[PDB]
Symmetry: C3
Subunit: 440 residues, 3 copies
């Protein structure tokens, strides 16, 4: 499983539209559910929103220059659906499409392959007003949007990702209400999860109809579950958390079914129509895998919707998010996914870490982020050397940005953003990543 | 046979002088046999000629910049003998030599290693008027020209190629008359083949006399032969086609003899003088291998000079040239050459494909050329992983150019040339090649 | 030993402060022992000195541009102790610190990792006036200087080297008197060797106290010894020369003891205080290995301090220094060092060769330097493929420079320096090294 001649590996960085673009009410853009959600008192730390963010809508040439300087071969970005179709379905916003044309063409001029993500959580509010992902029609609206983007951009862009982290859009957005649109209802979360996955499948078929050379995948985040206890009920807690976070989304895509143990525990029906599971399980060219941390759980008969709770394990390394740092879990997750779901290949579409950064003498020295990055790259390559088909790695993120309900206080960039001036300052982790790209 | 530490691989692009330079009657250049041949009604499609071509004589800085942008480490180009010695033998044209000085120095400033080919078919007409390659003296004229080029440029240029594709210069130029100088006579083709190969050997010795650190090879195109029939006579047809196309030129270089079955079938004498076969078979640092397609043949008792004919096999993928696409033959050819001729190392000095390209919105999306390139690189690395010493790959061609008797209608570039404006437009295949160079 | 996914390799070039900087009495710099030594007639060939050298203090941006052009990932340089602390201990010289800040920041802007060496022989004369390395306090002065440099620069610089080639500073500087400070006394050489090594250990501990992520090593030159004789006394000569050159410095660092056979043969006491050997042998992240040549010796009962003499072996290839070229010794040395001393990893911090160069038509063609470089890189990778953990290679040197007692007459650069104009001219070896960096 050692390197052989001709083998390739792609190095990238990742962002998303609402987190960096700004220009939220400029260039014809319509509001997203995160514009609305960010206006709710208490929804986002410090009352932050994405109105300006990193002003990447105006500063994209600088950010593209930083990518070329890093030496990445690829740039994972998302298209803001409400920027290009403000009404969700209907007329294209030519000014919005022109922005992505300039972004794409600028990347290609610099030798960077853009990897578009079609849905990274910024659903048009116009479609939320019709029920959003609770409405089955939203899967079809998404597929039509996806087709239009492929028709516009696939002459240049050959590697597509449909949706990003349906776990967050479905469960965090519709069951726990801590992400847009902020709904708290199990049935709604179930419906949303099915329509996100159906949208993925319909969009995949729509993209392939544009051209047979195009590649398509989905990005799923996986959160491996462990328990500190030995009781059978604590082992059940691990099984339930794994089903809720991981198998609920992986099983439809790769096995054409929902995990029966979770379906039974929910006691609700997934709104599956004829043809849905064939569409959701349509073959993919790759899995986009997001990994950051493992969760520690224990049984809790009182917890809902499933009888387990999170545990904060003692004496473990944690990031500024409070997330456990455990790179060995990354290796084991990659091996598990390859055996369980057998994706043709895997791209790490996100991995990274957030820490308290300080600017000293105009510079940012972030050794904790360097250490996380080094150890997780090592863990990834450990899996690749065992035969897991990992074809590339995208660092989350190129720049500090709007970290959803945490706002701007949580910095994931390898490049620092001073939001007072929009100055970009490469951190120590940027120089480390630059070296790794060149010298591997 | 996997990668080991220290192993190297060279990525390049290839062109030739008459096909790109233009400035055919500028800078003191004298006419070549292709200037003459292109003036004959019916000799070249659409009446095309190389008077202007890609105007690389003036635009070489842009083309070198495109090479740096692609990331190639090497540039295979040819020196126009009639630009540097218009009378074929005698005085150097200082203006022509200064052009190659500027080209070479510009490549080196950009980190690109130029690989000069001394003869890529543009014999000075002054020498054709004395018999060209039919005249034994032409081997010596070529060797003197080669010595002068090494004396001028080998302070910088360490890797030389003498001649390119003697199959074309000898048989297509002097037996079939479809390439310059347009002669149609078997004995003349035999004489030309021997004097091309003798010129190669004399030039190799002359270059090594300039400096012992210099490396020298020859570029041969090989066209593997198959048959769809099972008869013994169709198997004989394969042997005859292989002998005519491949062994006629490979056997003198690597085995110091002409293939006896073809000599006997011709019924003519090769004009071999004392010392010739030792000179032709002088040890080489590498073979430059050109590969594009395999030929399908069958026996034909009426055919001349040998009793076989070409067959257009049914239901196979073909390029815009009508050439079969069969990358597995590339792997098998590389393995066979390594066993049969055992060159110290192999450089793919040409491989590529031509398709009808369309400019849409100022861009050129050429998925069929991308696919050919991907599959032939895969096939080449398959041979390298079996132990074949392939040390580099040069894509034919950087830019669309004058495709000999096909004229400009046949486009081999990974960069499109709009001949009305001389604009260069990178095709999808350019972005693919750029990625492969970086990420392998 | 199987190249695997994730393995890295660092390509660099090396210089040192006194050899390139110039500006010896500018920018607040205080004199070093080499400023003083170079003023003594007969100490340096042609009366050369480092007053101007390559004027890199003023031309560093040009030199950094040349490094970026070569494509190196790393730049090994030394900090001039008397430029940053002119009195050796005490006040920092802000102008000197600012120079290294600009150098470091310029390298990082270009994607180059600076590798600082803290002591490359330019001891402040103010400290020599107090006994220099003969004075135990010099080990502590060095450690305090090292701590201040890490405090200033380790926000950016993570890989440190303490001292370079104590063989030269101790034996050539204090026993043979052919390098600064020009002393000729065995006991002084022994004292100096101990305080250099103690300084290394104290500085390593001081650097690690600044930040636990910092890496530290030492650079040792090793000169493998052979004999042409078969007698038992000539085999003893090999053991003595190996002990004098190599084990005297390697054994303290990696085995916490001085080689007992050499201690006995000297018959002198090393000024070891309790605790010193634990300090000297403090664990290192890597060994910086310098290799240029092997020595041939024979027994000589009359020789001092040890009964052997150098032999000039007949009929071997030699550089312009008179040094034997024998790349196989490099492979065997790397294997031996890894087996006997087991450094966690090895960086080749210096290897290279000097030849008489000639400028012809504004260019420098140096095939003998190319050949040495090619063969020693091959020999290094042979050791890596046997499992030796060689993580990078730094060519000595980026530019021609002041070759100590040989002056400017001995040119080690892959880039030529015309000292009349300070023009930099890349040699053939620069283009070769550029290719190796890209294509390996
Ligand atoms: O939480 C960090 C990172 N993980 C997942 C999301 O895709 C991304 O937008 C977010 O910023
Ligand atoms: O036919 C394509 C290509 N192959 C052979 C020749 O070397 C080159 O000049 C030509 O353009
Ligand atoms: O002698 C060549 C080279 N060897 C070792 C020294 O570190 C360096 O300064 C010197 O120039």
């Amino acid at each position: 499983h050692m390197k052989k001649w001709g083998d390739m590996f792609t190095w990238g960085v990742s962002t998303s539209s609402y987190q960096i673009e700004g220009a939220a009410n400029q260039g014809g853009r319509g509001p997203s559910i995160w514009d609305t959600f960010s206006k709710i008192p208490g929804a986002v730390a410090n009352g932050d929103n994405g109105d300006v963010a990193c002003d990447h809508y105006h500063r994209y040439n600088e950010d593209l220059d930083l990518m070329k300087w890093l030496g990445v071969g690829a740039y994972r970005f998302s298209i803001a659906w409400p920027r290009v179709i403000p009404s969700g379905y209907g007329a294209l916003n030519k000014e919005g499409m022109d922005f992505y044309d300039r972004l794409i063409d600028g990347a290609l001029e610099r030798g960077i392959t853009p990897w578009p993500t079609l849905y990274h959580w910024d659903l048009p509010q116009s479609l939320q007003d019709k029920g959003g992902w609770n409405n089955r029609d939203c899967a079809y609206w998404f597929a039509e949007y996806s087709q239009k983007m492929a028709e516009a951009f696939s002459d240049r862009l050959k590697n597509w990702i449909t949706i990003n982290e349906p776990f967050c859009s479905a469960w965090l957005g519709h069951l726990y209400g801590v992400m847009a649109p902020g709904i708290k209802d199990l049935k709604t979360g179930i419906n949303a999860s099915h329509h996100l996955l159906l949208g993925h499948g319909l969009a995949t078929k729509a993209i392939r109809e544009v051209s047979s050379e195009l590649k398509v995948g989905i990005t799923l985040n996986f959160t491996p579950a462990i328990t500190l206890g030995e009781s059978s009920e604590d082992k059940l807690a691990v099984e339930l958390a794994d089903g809720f976070d991981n198998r609920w989304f992986g099983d439809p895509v790769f096995k054409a079914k929902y995990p029966e143990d979770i379906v039974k525990a929910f006691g609700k029906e997934v709104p599956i129509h004829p043809g849905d599971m064939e569409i959701i399980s349509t073959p993919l060219d790759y899995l986009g895998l997001n990994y950051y941390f493992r969760q520690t759980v224990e049984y809790d008969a009182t917890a809902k919707p499933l009888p387990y709770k999170q545990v904060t394990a003692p004496n473990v390394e944690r990031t500024g998010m409070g997330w456990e740092v455990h790179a060995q879990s990354f290796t084991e997750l990659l091996e598990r996914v390859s055996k369980e779901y057998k994706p043709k290949e895997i791209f790490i579409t996100e991995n990274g870490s957030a820490w308290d950064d300080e600017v000293v003498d105009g510079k940012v020295d972030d050794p904790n982020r360097v250490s996380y990055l080094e150890r997780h790259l090592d863990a990834m390559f450990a899996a690749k050397n065992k035969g897991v088909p990992i074809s590339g790695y995208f660092a989350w993120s190129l720049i500090d940005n709007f970290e959803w309900a945490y706002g701007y206080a949580k910095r994931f960039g390898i490049i620092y953003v001073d939001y007072q001036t929009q100055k970009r300052i490469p951190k120590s982790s940027a120089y480390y990543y630059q070296k790794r790209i060149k010298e591997s």
